[PDB]
Amino acid sequence: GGMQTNSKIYIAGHKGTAGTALVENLQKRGFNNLVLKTRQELDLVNQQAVAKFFKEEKPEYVFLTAVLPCGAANVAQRADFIYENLMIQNNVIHNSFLNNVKKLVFFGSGYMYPENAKNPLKEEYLFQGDLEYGAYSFGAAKIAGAIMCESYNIQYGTNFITLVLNNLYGTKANFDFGKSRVLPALLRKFHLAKLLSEGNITQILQDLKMNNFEEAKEYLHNFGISKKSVEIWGTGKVRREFIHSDDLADVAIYTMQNIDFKDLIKDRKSKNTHINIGTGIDYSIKEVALMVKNIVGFSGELVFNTSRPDSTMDRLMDCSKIHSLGWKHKIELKDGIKMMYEWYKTQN
Amino acid sequence: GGMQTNSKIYIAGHKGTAGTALVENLQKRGFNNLVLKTRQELDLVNQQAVAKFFKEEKPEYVFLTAVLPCGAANVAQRADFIYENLMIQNNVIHNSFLNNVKKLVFFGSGYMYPENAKNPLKEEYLFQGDLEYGAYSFGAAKIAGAIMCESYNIQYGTNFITLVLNNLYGTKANFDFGKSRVLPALLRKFHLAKLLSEGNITQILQDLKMNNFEEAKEYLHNFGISKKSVEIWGTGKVRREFIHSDDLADVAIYTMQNIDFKDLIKDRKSKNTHINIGTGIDYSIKEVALMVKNIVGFSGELVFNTSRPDSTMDRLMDCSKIHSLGWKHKIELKDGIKMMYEWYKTQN
Numbered sequence A, B: 001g002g003m004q005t006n007s008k009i010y011i012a013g014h015k016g017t018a019g020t021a022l023v024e025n026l027q028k029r030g031f032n033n034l035v036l037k038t039r040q041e042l043d044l045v046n047q048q049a050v051a052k053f054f055k056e057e058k059p060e061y062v063f064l065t066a067v068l069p070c071g072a073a074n075v076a077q078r079a080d081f082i083y084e085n086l087m088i089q090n091n092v093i094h095n096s097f098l099n100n101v102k103k104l105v106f107f108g109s110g111y112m113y114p115e116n117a118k119n120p121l122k123e124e125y126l127f128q129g130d131l132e133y134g135a136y137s138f139g140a141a142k143i144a145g146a147i148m149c150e151s152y153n154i155q156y157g158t159n160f161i162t163l164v165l166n167n168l169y170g171t172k173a174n175f176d177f178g179k180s181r182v183l184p185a186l187l188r189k190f191h192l193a194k195l196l197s198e199g200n201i202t203q204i205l206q207d208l209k210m211n212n213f214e215e216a217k218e219y220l221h222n223f224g225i226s227k228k229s230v231e232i233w234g235t236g237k238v239r240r241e242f243i244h245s246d247d248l249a250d251v252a253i254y255t256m257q258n259i260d261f262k263d264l265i266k267d268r269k270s271k272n273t274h275i276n277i278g279t280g281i282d283y284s285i286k287e288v289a290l291m292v293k294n295i296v297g298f299s300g301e302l303v304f305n306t307s308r309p310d311s312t313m314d315r316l317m318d319c320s321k322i323h324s325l326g327w328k329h330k331i332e333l334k335d336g337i338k339m340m341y342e343w344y345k346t347q348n
C-alpha cells in the first residue's frame, strides 16, 4: 500500500528545483532509500545508459523531474526541446515498465494546454486548440509524456501518473540568471537592487559571477536594475500561478501513497487522466513583483515598461480534480517567497 | 533536381508496403545506391544501433517508412504505438541531423487530425480538437513526428518533410491478418470466401498454410469468412480515402526532388509545414467492399456487425497544397485493387 520506508526510490534529475525538494521532503518523511545520478553519471537522453541503470538499480518508485526546460533565453532551441525531452521521457518511462517499477510520477507543464484555452485550465482542455508558438515543440513533447504514461497504464496496467504545473519556485531554487525562472529571478533582481541602492559593491560582486564592478552594474542594468528603481518589461497585467516546491513534493508523495490509475478512470473510453497541481490562485506580475519588493525591503520604484508588450497568455490551473482526490496546497505565495529569500541570503 | 542516380539513399522499413514500393520505384528509375536494413539487422527502436548505422553508413537521403501501424486487429497495443513510433522517429530524425543527411521524407497519418475536424482535412486542422480514441496514442506519436521535422528545419536548417496520408494499400501488400490494412484484408477475405463457395478445400489449406480443415473453417468463421458472405465489423458507413503505394512512392520521390522546407514557410508563420497527400476521393467501407467483391468475383453478400463503439469518423485529405506544389495522384481505386489482386494470386 504505497511507498514503504525501505522502498527504493529514484528521483531523476535530483539536482534541479523539483528534484532537490523531492529528496529533502522524502527523507523528512522517512524515505531515505534513494538512488540518485547526476547528469555526468547518467545522461537520460542515452537509452543504453538508462536501460543499464534500471537493470542494475531496479527502483520501485520513480519521480521523473529531469527536463530541458523552455525559457525566454533559450527559446531558439526548438528542435532540442522536443527531441531531448521526448528521449528522457521515453527512456525513463519505458525502462521503468520493463523493470517492474511499482509507480512513477511524471511532471507536466502548462505549456501543454492551448494558448487560448479558458483559465482556469481544466485537464480536458488538452488538444482544444494550438499551443503557444514559442513553447510549441516543448508543449508537444510534454503532451507525449502525458499520453505515454496513460497508454502504459491502459495496455500494461502500470501506475504512471502525470502531474501538470505552471510556475515552480522553492526554498532552494535555481537562481542562475541564464535559465531565468520567473519567481527566483525576480527575487534576486530586487535583492541586487537593494544591495545596489545601499552602495554594497562587494556582495553584488560575490553574488554575481563577476570581478569587475563596472561590468556588474552594466549587467544589472540589462536586467532593469538601478539604484532607485526596478523596471520590468510589459504592462504587468499578465497573470501567473506559482507552486512552492515543498508543495510540489507534498502532492507528488501524496500521489504515490494514494492515487492509482484506477482512481482516475472514466466509465468507458478513459482519457485526460493527467492531474493539474498548483495553488489554484493566480497573481499579476505586478502583484508578484510588489510582494517580492516588500519582502526584500527594496526602497526604490517599481516601473512597468509598457512600450514593449508582454504578449504572454495567462496560465492558471483548475485544481479541482486533485482537490477532490484529497490534496490541497499548504504554502501561500507570500509565505513561500519569504522562505525562499531567507534561504537565499544564507547561501553566498 | 536533388537526388542523383548515385546518391546514397536509405529507405527505413524497406520490406513494408510503403517501403517495398519505394525501393522498386527508386531502382527502376535508375537510383542505384540504396542502403537497406531489415529489422533483424537494425532495430530502429534501439538508439545505439541507429546512431552506429548513420555514423558508419552516412546516407545522403532518407525515406522513413518504418512504423508500428495502428489497425483494427492491434488496437490494444496503445502503449507500443506511442513508444515504438516515437523512438523510430526520434532515432532516425536526430541521427540524420547528426550525420548531415541532406534531405529526409517522413510519413504522417490522418489520425494526427481531430476526430471532429471538417473533411476534407486541411493541414492547419492540426491541434484543433481531440483525436479519435482508438488511434489516440498513434496519432499523438505521428503529431510529434511532424513537429520534430519542422523543429529541426527551423532551429538547424535541416530539410525534413512530412507527407501525411490516410489509408495505404499497394500491389505487393501485406495480407497477413495480424497487421494487414483494411484494403488488403478485405481482398483476402473475399478471395477466401470465393474458394469456400467453390468448395476447393486444398487451395484454402494452401492459402492459410494449414493442414487441418476443421481448424481452417474455424479460423475463417472467426474472421467473418463464409461461403455465402463476408462480414465487416462496423456500420460500413464511414468514409475513407485510400492511396496506392506506387502513388505514395511517386509523391515521396517528387517531394525529394522538388519540395524544400524553404518553399513551405510563409515568412514568420512557419507552422503546419506538413503536406497532405492522397487521391482526393472518398469511399464508404461498404463501397470499397463490394468493389473488392466484384473484382474477385465472390457470389455472396456483405453483412455488417454493428458493434458497441464504431469509428463514425471520416478521413479525407484536402490536397490543395500538394496539388499546388505540382503533384497529383494517378491510380484510381478500382485499378489499384486489380493490380493488388493480380499480384496476390501470383503468391497463391
Ligand SMILES: NC(=O)C1=CN([C@@H]2O[C@H](COP(=O)(O)OP(=O)(O)OC[C@H]3O[C@@H](n4cnc5c(N)ncnc54)[C@H](OP(=O)(O)O)[C@@H]3O)[C@@H](O)[C@H]2O)C=CC1
Pocket: A012, A013, A014, A015, A016, A017, A018, A019, A038, A039, A040, A042, A043, A044, A045, A064, A065, A066, A067, A068, A069, A088, A107, A108, A109, A110, A165, A166, A167, A168, A169, A174, A181
Ligand atoms: N520550474 C518550472 O517553472 C516548471 C517546472 N515544470 C516541470 O517540473 C519538472 C522539474 O522542473 P525543474 O525542477 O524546474 O527542472 P530544473 O531544470 O530545475 O532541473 C532539471 C534537472 O534535470 C537534469 N537534466 C536535464 N537533462 C538531463 C539529462 N539529459 N540527463 C540527466 N539529467 C538531466 C538537470 O541536470 P543539470 O542541472 O546537470 O542540467 C537538472 O538537475 C520538469 O518536468 C518541468 O517541466 C513544469 C512547469 C514549469
Ligand SMILES: NC(=O)C1=CN([C@@H]2O[C@H](COP(=O)(O)OP(=O)(O)OC[C@H]3O[C@@H](n4cnc5c(N)ncnc54)[C@H](OP(=O)(O)O)[C@@H]3O)[C@@H](O)[C@H]2O)C=CC1
Pocket: B012, B013, B014, B015, B016, B017, B018, B019, B038, B039, B040, B042, B043, B044, B045, B064, B065, B066, B067, B068, B069, B088, B107, B108, B109, B110, B111, B165, B166, B167, B168, B169, B174, B181, B182
Ligand atoms: N496502412 C495505413 O492504412 C496507414 C498508413 N500510414 C503510414 O504508413 C507508413 C508506412 O506504411 P507501411 O510501410 O504500410 O507500414 P508497415 O507496417 O506495412 O511497414 C512497416 C515496416 O517498418 C518495419 N519496422 C517496424 N518497426 C521496426 C523496427 N523497430 N526496426 C526495424 N524495422 C522496423 C517493419 O518491419 P517488420 O515487418 O519486421 O515489422 C515493416 O517492414 C507509416 O509511416 C504510416 O504513417 C498512416 C496511416 C494509415
